Enzyme design. Structure first.
Site, PDB file in Angstrom:
ATOM      1  N   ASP A 349       0.834  -1.192   0.000  1.00 27.82           N
ATOM      2  CA  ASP A 349       0.000   0.000   0.000  1.00 27.82           C
ATOM      3  C   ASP A 349       0.873   1.246   0.000  1.00 27.82           C
ATOM      4  O   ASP A 349       1.944   1.269   0.610  1.00 27.82           O
ATOM      5  CB  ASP A 349      -0.916   0.032   1.215  1.00 27.82           C
ATOM      6  CG  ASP A 349      -1.907  -1.097   1.216  1.00 27.82           C
ATOM      7  OD1 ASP A 349      -1.945  -1.846   0.221  1.00 27.82           O
ATOM      8  OD2 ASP A 349      -2.655  -1.233   2.208  1.00 27.82           O
ATOM      9  N   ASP A 670      -4.083  -2.911   6.235  1.00 28.45           N
ATOM     10  CA  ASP A 670      -4.431  -2.362   7.540  1.00 28.45           C
ATOM     11  C   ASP A 670      -5.853  -1.837   7.639  1.00 28.45           C
ATOM     12  O   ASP A 670      -6.318  -1.610   8.758  1.00 28.45           O
ATOM     13  CB  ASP A 670      -3.466  -1.232   7.927  1.00 28.45           C
ATOM     14  CG  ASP A 670      -3.533  -0.047   6.977  1.00 28.45           C
ATOM     15  OD1 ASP A 670      -4.176  -0.154   5.911  1.00 28.45           O
ATOM     16  OD2 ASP A 670      -2.937   1.002   7.302  1.00 28.45           O
ATOM     17  N   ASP A 674     -10.135  -5.394   4.552  1.00 26.12           N
ATOM     18  CA  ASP A 674      -9.167  -6.254   3.887  1.00 26.12           C
ATOM     19  C   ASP A 674      -9.083  -7.648   4.492  1.00 26.12           C
ATOM     20  O   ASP A 674      -8.141  -8.380   4.187  1.00 26.12           O
ATOM     21  CB  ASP A 674      -7.790  -5.601   3.905  1.00 26.12           C
ATOM     22  CG  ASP A 674      -7.862  -4.104   3.769  1.00 26.12           C
ATOM     23  OD1 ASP A 674      -8.579  -3.619   2.869  1.00 26.12           O
ATOM     24  OD2 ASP A 674      -7.193  -3.411   4.555  1.00 26.12           O
TER      25      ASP A 674
END
Ligand SMILES: CCCCC/C=C/C/C=C/C/C=C/C/C=C/CCCC(=O)O[C@@H](COC(=O)CCCCCCCCCCCCCCCCC)COP(=O)(O)O[C@@H]1[C@H](O)[C@H](O)[C@@H](OP(=O)(O)O)[C@H](OP(=O)(O)O)[C@H]1O
Ligand SMILES: *[C@@H]1O[C@H](CO)[C@@H](O)[C@H](O)[C@H]1NC(C)=O
Ligand SMILES: *[C@@H]1O[C@H](CO)[C@@H](O)[C@H](O)[C@H]1NC(C)=O
Ligand SMILES: *[C@@H]1O[C@H](CO)[C@@H](O)[C@H](O)[C@H]1NC(C)=O
Ligand SMILES: *[C@@H]1O[C@H](CO)[C@@H](O)[C@H](O)[C@H]1NC(C)=O
Ligand SMILES: *[C@@H]1O[C@H](CO)[C@@H](O)[C@H](O)[C@H]1NC(C)=O
Ligand SMILES: *[C@@H]1O[C@H](CO)[C@@H](O)[C@H](O)[C@H]1NC(C)=O
Ligand SMILES: [Ca+2]
Lengths: 939, 332
Positions: A349, A670, A674
Site C-alpha cells: 500500500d 491495515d 481487507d
C-alpha cells in the site's frame, strides 16, 4: 435485591434474550435506558468518571477479565508428550533390551546408561524450549492493548468507537443509524442495524465499521455470551519425516545383515571346521557370544537412527522467532516464519508503508502567480493572505490543535486530520499564526457541518464574517470542485470572474505538472452571500457551486529514505513487488517511479481500476480466471482500487497456473475491509501502530515500525532456517555412511566391530545430540538475499551436499581401513586384531577409535559451508554455542581416552600417538579444501 | 649356690630305627665333672657310669666344661635295648676328686626315662609320569606296620595339606581324574598319631614343564629400566636359560656391559635391563625352561622408544596449518 438491586445474572439473562423477544424487556421491567442507568448507580451524562475508590462498591461483580485463558501446561506433562515420538520409543526399547541382556550376562550395564543420555538430552531440551516459546508468546500478545482508555472498565457509558472489536456488551442507550458487523460471530456477513427498541442490544465478537450512538458496558469476562461460545470447545515437516523414515529403514536392514553374517560366520567356524560336540557345560560361552553379537546389532541400529533431526527444526524455529521479535517483526503463526522464505511477490500500500505520512505543502498557486518553493509571507499581497488565513481558520475544526510531537525530536504528532496539519503548517509558512484566529473565531451561524459527505468529500463551513457578511467556504478535492466555481482571486486582491477560457489549459498547467512531481492538489473555495438577508441554509443547491477559488496547494508526503534500497534488494532476490494505492493514477505513477518500482521506457501495466474491472469480469458479470492471466504478470500499479479488488487480484495471482512455479504472495493490509485479502494470501503482514484490530487479528506477521524494509528482514531469516537444517543434515549423513560401512565390513572379516558398543554410543551421542545444537543456531549472513527462491518441488539432499558427503566419506573410509589393517606396523605396536573374548583393551583399537572421533570433530567445522565456500572459518566467532560444544567434546574425548580403562575398553596413549591423531584430524580440513576444487556439473 | 636344675629334658617315647638327643644343662658352683648315670627301665636304683663309645658307638655323650655344665646325649639306632633311665647329677663338693668316699657327696635328681616302640612302615605306590593321556592316576600308601593307636591321616602336596583328605584311613588313596602338569609335585601322606611322631613318606609326581604366563611384549623409552618374566609349573622344577634372537637364530646373551639382572627362583625368571640403547637392545628374547622330561619355550618382543618421537608430528601439524592459511588468503 438489596444493595445490588440488579444482579449480574439478571443483566446476563436480559442480554441472552435478543431481537423482538427482547423488546418487552427493553420497554418494561427496567423502564428505559435512563432507568437502567439508575439501577446501575450511574448517570446518562457521565456515569462513572473512572474513580478508583468506587471499585468493589457499585458493582462488586467484576471478578476478572479472563486474562489467563487456559494455561494448562506443566513441565512434566511437556516432557511426557515430547517423549511419545517414534524415534524416542525406539531408543527406549533399545535401552530396555540392552539392559535386560546385560543383567543376564552370565561394565556391561554401561550400555544402558550411555543410551539413556541420548534420551534425556533430547526430552529436556525440547520440552523447556516449547515452554519458553509459549511464555514469550504470552509476553508479547498481552501487550496488545487498544484501550475506552483502560484495560478493563465497567459501569460506564461510552460513545461510538468504530474500527475496533467490541469487548463489552449491552444495549445502546441512545443513538441512530447504528450499524455493526456480525460476520464471523453468527456466520452472516450481512450488516444489521441496531433499532432503538426492536433490537438495541450489542454483543462482543462484532466489528463496528460505521454508525452513530452511545452504549453502556455490561460485560465482565467469560460470563459474556462470546466467552460462553468458545468455552464449549507445513510442507517442510512432511519431507523431513519422509527422509527420517527412509534412513531408519536402511539402518534396520543393515543391522539385520550384520547380525546374520556374524552369527553365521561364528557357527560355521565353530562346528563345520572344528567339529566340537556340544556339552551341557558349554552353553554359557555360546550365550555370551550370542549376547555380544546382539548388542552389536542393536547399537548399529541406534547409531543410524536420526534421533536428532526432530530437534534441529524446533531449535532453529524457536531461535528464529525470538531473534525476529527484536527485528521489528512479531510472529504469531510458526508456519509464516519458514513460508516467507519462498515468497515470490509482495503487494503493498502507498500510504503507511512507502510514505512517512508527514505530508507538507510544497508548491502554491496564489494570486495568479506560481511558487514552486515555500512562499514568502510578503511575496503575495497581504489582503489575499489574510483572507485565505481567515477562511482556512474558520473552516478548520477547533479540536484539531497542534499537540507538539509527543516526544519531539523523536516522533511527530500530526493531530487527527492528516491533511489539516499540512494546511495549518502553510498558515505558519506565511508568517501568520493559526491559533490566534482559531481562538478568535466563535460559534457563528453554524450551518457549516456538511458532515463531509461521501460523494462530495468536502469540508464545508458556511458562517457569517465578523462584519455580518454570510459566506460559505469549502475545502475539497481540487478536480471535483474546480468546476463548482465562478470567481478566482488575483494578485491584487481582485475577484476576477472564473471563465471557461480560464478553465482551459491554464489550470491544467498549474496542477498536472505538480501531480507528475508527486503532489496532491487541494483547492480553496468560498462563495459570498448578501449580508441582508441571510442565505437560505435549506437552499443548499446554490451554496455548493459557483464559489470562488482563492488558491490551490500541492501537499505531498515524502518516501522514506530507506525504502529504495530495500526494494532494490528485494528485486535482486527475485521478489517482484506490485503496488495497490487507491488514489489518483498520475500521483501513484509519479511516486512509484521515484520509489524504484517502475523504470521509464519499459513496457509495464498500470490501470485505473475501472478497466481492470472490465477486463476481469466477463459478459455475465463473473470471474473466468483466464482473461486475468494475461494481465497480472505485467501489472505493477493499480490506482483508485477498492479493497474488494485486492482480494480478487491476490486470488488471481495465487491460483494461476500459467507459470510453472506456484506464486507465493504476501500482501500487506491495515484497513477494515481487507479481511479476506490477508486471509487468502500465504502470509499476511499487518501494520502495528497504524492499523485497525480487524486487520491485525486476521494476519500472520505484525510489523512494529510500519516500515517496508522490515519485510526484507523477514525474508532473510525465513531462508536461513532452511539452510540451517540443510547443513546439519549434511554432517549427520557423513557419519552414518562411515559408521555402518565399518561395522558391517569389519565384522565381515575380523569377527568383531573395530569400534565396540560403548564407543559407538558415544559417537552417536555426539552426532545426534550435540551436532543439532552446534549447527542449528547459526545467525544469518547478508548473502542469503542473492539467490532465487526455491519452491515446493525440490529435493532435500542438494547436488552439492552429495558431493561433500561422498568426498569426505571416501577419505574417512580409506584412512580407517588402512589403520585397521596395517597399523600394527606404522606405529610399531602390538596387534589387536582377532582378540579373544574378555581380552584386555589393546592399544591398536584405541588409535582407531580416537582417530575416528577426531576426524568427526574436525569435519563438524567443515560442514558449516554448503555452497562451495572456501573460508570455512568465516564467522565462526559469531556463534558461542558452536565453539563451546566443539571444545567441550574435545576435552571430554581426551579425558575418556586417558582415564577410561576397562569400562570404555580404551587404554592410555603416549604423547607420540596423540599428535598423529590430531595430524590426521587436520588432514581432514585440508582434504575438505581440496574437494571443493571439482565442478559439480561434470559429475 | 645349691645345685638347681635349669633345663631338664623330657621323657622320651620314641620308636625303632630312630635317633634322638637329650639335653641336660645345670649351673655348677664349683662346676663338677659332668657324667651320666644309667639305670634299667624297671629299676631306677642302678647308677652305672655312662661313657661314650659303649654299645658300639650307638650312644655318644658330649660335655662342655665351663660356667654351666652342659651335657648332650645322642642316641642312634633305637631298639628295644635303648629303654632306660638316664640321670645327670651336679656336685658342689670342692673335694670331688676323692672318689674313695661315702656316697654322701652332694647330688641332684634329674632322671629321664627313654622307651622305644615299633618303627612305622609305609608302603607307597610307584612313581608316575603324567603324560597327555586322560587316564586318572591313583596314588596309594599303606600303613603296614603301626604299633600305635592311629589318630588321622592326610595327603599333602608341596607342604600344603590337600582339602578333605582327613579320615581314619589306615590305608589311604588319592585319585586325580584329569592329571595335568599343574598337578605334578612332591606328594606326601602324613600319618598323625595320638602319642607318636608323624610319618610322611614321599611320592613324587613328575611332568614336563609348562609355561603359565608371560608378557607378550614390552615397550619402554630409552634410558629406562625393562623387566621380563616367565612363570612355569611342573615337577621336579626345571633349569632356566634365557636367549636372544639374532639373524634368524637363537643366541646366548652375555652380561657384557653389566646391565642384565637375571633373578631365578623355583618358578619365575626376571630379566632386567637398565639404560636402554636403541642400537642393539630392541629385538626378541626367549625363556627356555628345561627339565628331566622335556623343555618348553615362549618368546617375547621388546622395542625401545626414541625420545624424539613427538617432534615429527609437530612438524606435520605446522605443515598443515601453513598449507591451509596460504590457500585461504590466496582465495581472497
Ligand atoms: C545417502 O545419501 O545416504 C544414506 C544414509 O544411510 C544411512 O543413514 C544408513 C544406511 C547406511 C548404509 C548405506 C550408506 C541413505 O539414505 P536414504 O536412502 O535414507 O536417503 C536417500 C537420499 O536422501 C537420496 O538423496 C534420495 O534419493 P531419491 O530422491 O532419488 O529417492 C532418497 O531420499 P529422499 O527421497 O527422502 O530424498 C534416498 O535414496
Ligand atoms: C581307625 O579305626 C581303627 C579301629 O578302631 C583304629 O585302630 C585306628 O587307630 C583308627 N585310625 C584313625 C582314627 O586314624
Ligand atoms: C593298600 O591299601 C589298600 C586300601 O586298603 C588295599 O586295598 C591294598 O591291598 C593295600 N596294599 C597292600 C600292598 O597292602
Ligand atoms: C616328613 O618328615 C620328613 C623328615 O625327614 C621331611 O623330610 C618331610 O618333608 C616331611 N613331610 C612334609 C610334608 O613336611
Ligand atoms: C652382571 O653383572 C652385574 C654386576 O655385578 C650383576 O649384578 C649381574 O647379576 C650380572 N649378570 C648375571 C646374569 O649374573
Ligand atoms: C609356582 O607357581 C605357583 C602358581 O602360581 C605359585 O603360587 C607358587 O608360589 C610357585 N611355587 C614355587 C615353589 O615357586
Ligand atoms: C630348550 O632347550 C633345550 C636344551 O636341550 C633344547 O633342546 C630345546 O629345543 C629348547 N626348547 C624348545 C621348545 O625349542
Ligand atoms: Ca542416532
Amino acid at each position: 435485591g438489596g444493595e445490588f438491586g440488579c444482579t449480574m445474572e439478571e443483566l446476563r439473562s436480559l442480554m441472552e434474550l435478543r431481537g423482538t423477544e427482547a423488546v418487552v424487556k427493553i420497554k418494561e421491567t427496567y423502564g428505559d435506558t435512563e432507568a437502567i442507568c439508575r439501577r446501575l448507580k450511574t448517570s446518562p451524562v457521565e456515569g462513572l468518571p473512572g474513580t478508583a475508590p468506587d471499585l468493589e462498591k457499585r458493582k462488586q461483580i467484576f471478578g476478572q477479565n479472563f486474562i489467563p485463558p487456559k494455561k494448562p501446561k506443566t513441565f512434566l506433562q511437556l516432557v511426557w508428550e515430547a517423549l511419545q515420538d517414534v524415534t524416542l520409543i525406539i531408543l527406549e526399547i533399545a535401552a530396555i533390551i540392552s539392559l535386560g541382556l546385560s543383567f543376564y550376562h552370565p561394565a556391561g550395564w554401561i550400555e544402558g546408561a550411555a543410551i539413556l543420555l541420548s534420551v534425556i538430552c533430547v526430552v529436556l531440551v525440547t520440552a523447556f524450549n516449547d515452554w519458553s516459546k509459549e511464555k514469550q508468546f504470552r509476553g508479547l500478545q498481552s501487550r496488545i492493548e487498544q484501550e475506552p482508555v483502560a484495560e478493563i472498565v465497567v459501569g460506564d457509558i461510552a460513545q461510538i468507537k468504530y474500527g475496533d472489536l467490541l469487548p463489552a456488551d449491552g444495549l445502546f442507550i441512545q443513538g441512530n443509524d447504528l450499524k455493526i458487523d456480525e460476520s464471523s460471530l453468527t456466520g452472516e456477513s450481512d450488516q444489521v442495524r441496531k433499532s432503538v427498541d426492536k433490537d438495541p442490544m450489542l454483543l462482543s465478537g462484532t466489528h463496528v465499521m460505521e454508525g452513530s450512538g452511545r452504549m453502556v458496558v455490561t460485560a465482565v469476562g467469560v460470563n459474556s455470551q462470546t466467552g460462553i461460545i468458545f468455552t464449549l470447545l507445513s510442507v517442510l515437516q512432511g519431507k523431513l519425516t519422509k527422509l527420517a523414515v527412509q534412513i531408519g529403514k536402511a539402518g534396520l536392514v543393515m543391522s539385520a545383515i550384520t547380525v546374520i553374517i556374524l552369527v553365521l560366520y561364528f557357527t560355521v567356524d565353530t562346528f563345520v571346521v572344528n567339529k566340537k560336540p556340544w556339552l551341557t557345560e558349554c552353553t554359557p560361552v555360546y550365550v555370551q557370544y550370542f549376547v555380544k553379537f546382539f548388542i552389536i546389532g542393536v547399537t548399529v541400529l541406534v547409531v543410524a537412527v536420526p534421533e536428532g533431526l526432530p530437534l534441529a527444526v524446533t531449535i532453529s524455529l524457536a531461535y528464529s522467532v525470538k531473534k525476529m521479535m527484536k527485528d521489528n517483526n512479531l510472529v504469531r503463526h510458526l508456519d509464516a516464519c519458514e513460508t516467507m522464505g519462498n515468497a515470490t511477490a509482495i503487494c503493498s500500500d502507498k500510504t503507511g508503508t512507502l510514505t512517512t505520512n508527514r505530508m507538507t505543502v510544497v508548491q502554491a498557486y496564489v494570486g495568479d502567480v506560481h511558487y514552486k518553493e515555500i512562499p514568502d509571507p510578503s511575496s503575495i499581497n497581504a489582503k489575499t493572505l489574510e483572507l485565505l488565513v481567515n477562511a482556512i481558520a474558520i473552516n478548520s475544526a477547533y479540536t484539531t490543535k497542534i499537540l507538539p510531537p509527543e516526544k519531539e525530536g523523536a516522533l511527530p504528532r500530526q493531530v487527527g486530520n492528516k491533511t489539516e496539519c499540512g494546511l495549518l503548517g502553510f498558515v505558519l509558512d506565511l508568517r501568520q499564526d493559526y491559533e490566534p484566529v482559531r481562538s478568535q473565531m466563535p460559534e457563528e451561524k453554524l450551518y457549516k457541518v456538511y458532515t463531509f459527505n461521501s460523494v462530495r468529500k468536502s469540508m464545508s463551513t458556511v458562517i457569517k464574517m465578523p462584519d455580518e457578511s454570510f459566506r460559505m467556504y469549502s475545502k475539497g478535492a481540487s478536480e471535483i470542485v474546480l468546476k463548482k466555481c465562478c470567481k478566482i482571486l488575483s494578485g491584487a486582491g481582485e475577484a476576477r470572474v472564473f471563465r471557461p477560457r480560464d478553465r482551459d489549459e491554464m489550470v491544467k498547467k498549474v496542477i498536472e505538472p505538480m501531480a507528475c512531481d508527486g503532489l496532491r492538489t487541494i483547492c480553496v473555495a468560498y462563495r459570498d452571500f448578501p449580508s441582508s438577508p441571510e442565505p437560505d441554509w435549506d437552499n443548499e443547491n446554490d451554496i455548493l457551486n459557483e464559489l470562488t477559488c482563492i488558491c490551490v496547494v500541492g501537499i505531498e508526503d515524502p518516501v522514506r529514505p530507506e525504502v529504495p534500497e530495500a526494494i532494490r534488494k528485494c528485486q535482486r532476490a527475485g521478489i517482484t513487488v506490485r503496488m495497490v494505492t487507491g488514489d489518483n493514477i498520475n500521483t501513484a505513477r509519479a511516486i512509484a517511479i521515484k520509489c524504484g518500482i517502475i523504470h521509464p521506457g519499459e513496457d509495464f501495466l498500470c490501470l485505473e481500476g475501472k478497466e481492470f474491472n472490465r477486463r476481469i469480469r466477463n459478459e455475465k458479470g463473473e470471474i473466468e480466471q483466464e482473461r486475468i492471466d494475461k494481465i497480472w504478470p505485467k501489472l505493477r500499479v493499480l490506482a483508485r482500487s477498492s479493497p474488494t479488488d485486492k482480494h480478487t487480484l491476490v486470488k488471481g495471482i495465487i491460483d494461476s497456473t500459467h507459470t510453472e512455479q506456484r506464486q507465493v504472495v504476501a500482501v500487506t493490509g491495515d484497513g477494515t475491509n481487507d479481511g479476506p485479502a490477508l486471509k487468502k494470501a500465504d502470509v499476511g503482514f499487518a501494520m502495528g501502530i497504524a492499523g485497525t484490530d480487524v486487520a491485525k487479528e486476521a494476519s500472520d506477521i505484525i510489523l512494529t515500525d510500519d516500515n517496508f524494509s522490515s519485510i526484507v528482514k523477514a525474508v532473510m531469516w525465513g531462508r536461513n532456517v532452511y539452510d540451517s537444517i540443510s547443513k546439519f543434515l549434511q554432517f549427520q549423513l557423513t557419519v552414518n555412511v562411515v559408521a555402518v560401512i565399518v561395522a558391517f565390513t569389519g565384522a565381515c572379516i575380523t569377527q568383531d566391530s573395530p569400534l565396540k558398543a560403548v564407543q559407538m554410543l558415544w559417537v552417536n551421542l555426539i552426532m545426534d545430540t550435540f551436532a543439532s545444537l552446534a549447527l542449528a543456531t547459526e545467525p544469518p549472513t547478508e548473502t542469503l538475499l542473492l539467490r532465487k527462491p526455491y519452491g515446493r518441488n525440490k529435493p532435500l539432499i542438494s547436488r552439492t551436499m552429495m558431493k561433500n558427503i561422498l568426498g569426505h566419506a571416501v577419505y574417512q573410509l580409506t584412512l580407517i581401513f588402512t589403520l585397521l589393517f596395517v597399523g600394527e606396523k606404522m606405529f610399531q605396536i602390538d596387534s589387536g586384531r582377532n582378540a579373544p573374548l574378555h581380552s584386555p583393551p589393546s592399544e591398536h583399537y584405541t588409535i582407531i577409535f580416537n582417530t575416528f572421533v577426531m576426524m568427526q570433530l574436525f569435519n563438524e567445522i567443515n560442514a558449516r559451508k554448503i555452497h562451495g565456500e572456501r573460508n570455512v572459518f568465516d564467522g565462526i566467532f559469531r556463534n558461542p554455542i558452536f565453539c563451546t560444544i566443539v571444545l567441550g567434546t574435545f576435552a571430554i574425548q581426551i579425558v575418556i581416552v586417558q582415564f577410561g580403562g576397562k569400562p570404555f575398553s580404551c587404554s592410555p596413549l603416549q604423547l607420540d600417538q596423540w599428535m598423529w591423531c590430531i595430524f590426521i584430524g587436520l588432514g581432514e580440513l585440508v582434504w575438505g579444501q581440496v574437494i571443493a576444487t571439482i565442478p559439480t556439473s561434470r559429475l | 649356690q645349691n645345685a638347681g636344675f635349669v633345663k631338664s629334658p623330657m621323657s622320651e617315647t620314641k620308636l625303632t630305627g630312630d635317633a634322638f638327643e637329650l639335653y641336660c644343662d645345670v649351673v655348677g658352683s664349683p662346676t663338677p665333672e659332668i657324667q651320666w648315670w644309667y639305670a634299667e627301665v624297671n629299676r631306677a636304683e642302678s647308677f652305672r657310669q655312662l661313657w661314650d663309645g659303649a654299645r658300639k658307638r650307638r650312644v655318644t655323650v658330649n660335655t662342655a666344661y665351663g660356667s654351666n655344665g652342659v651335657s648332650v646325649l645322642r642316641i642312634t639306632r633305637l631298639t628295644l635295648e635303648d629303654s632306660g633311665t638316664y640321670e645327670c647329677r651336679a656336685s658342689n663338693d670342692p673335694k670331688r676328686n676323692d672318689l674313695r668316699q661315702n656316697p654322701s657327696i652332694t647330688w641332684i635328681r634329674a632322671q629321664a626315662t627313654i622307651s622305644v616302640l615299633q618303627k612305622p612302615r609305609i608302603v607307597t605306590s610307584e612313581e608316575v609320569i603324567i603324560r597327555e593321556s586322560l587316564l586318572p592316576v591313583t596314588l596309594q600308601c599303606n600303613l603296614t606296620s603301626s604299633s600305635h593307636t592311629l589318630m588321622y591321616s592326610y595327603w599333602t602336596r608341596n607342604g600344603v595339606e590337600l582339602t578333605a583328605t582327613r579320615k581314619n584311613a589306615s590305608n589311604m588313596e588319592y585319585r586325580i581324574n584329569k592329571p595335568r602338569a599343574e598337578d605334578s609335585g612332591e606328594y606326601h601322606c602324613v600319618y598323625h598319631f595320638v602319642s607318636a611322631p608323624k610319618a610322611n613318606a614321599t611320592i613324587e609326581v613328575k611332568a614336563a614343564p609348562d609355561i603359565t604366563g608371560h608378557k607378550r611384549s614390552e615397550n619402554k623409552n630409552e634410558g629406562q629400566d625393562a623387566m621380563m618374566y616367565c612363570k612355569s609349573v611342573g615337577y621336579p622344577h626345571p633349569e632356566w636359560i634365557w636367549r636372544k634372537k639374532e639373524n634368524g637364530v637363537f643366541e646366548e646373551i652375555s652380561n657384557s656391559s653389566g646391565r642384565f639382572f637375571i633373578t631365578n627362583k623355583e618358578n619365575y625368571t626376571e630379566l632386567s635391563i637398565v639404560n636402554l640403547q636403541i642400537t642393539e637392545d630392541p629385538g626378541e628374547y626367549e625363556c627356555n625352561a628345561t627339565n628331566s622330561i622335556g623343555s618348553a619355550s615362549v618368546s617375547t618382543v621388546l622395542r625401545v622408544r626414541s625420545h624424539l618421537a613427538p617432534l615429527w608430528p609437530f612438524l606435520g601439524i605446522l605443515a598443515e596449518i601453513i598449507i591451509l592459511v596460504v590457500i585461504i588468503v590466496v582465495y581472497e
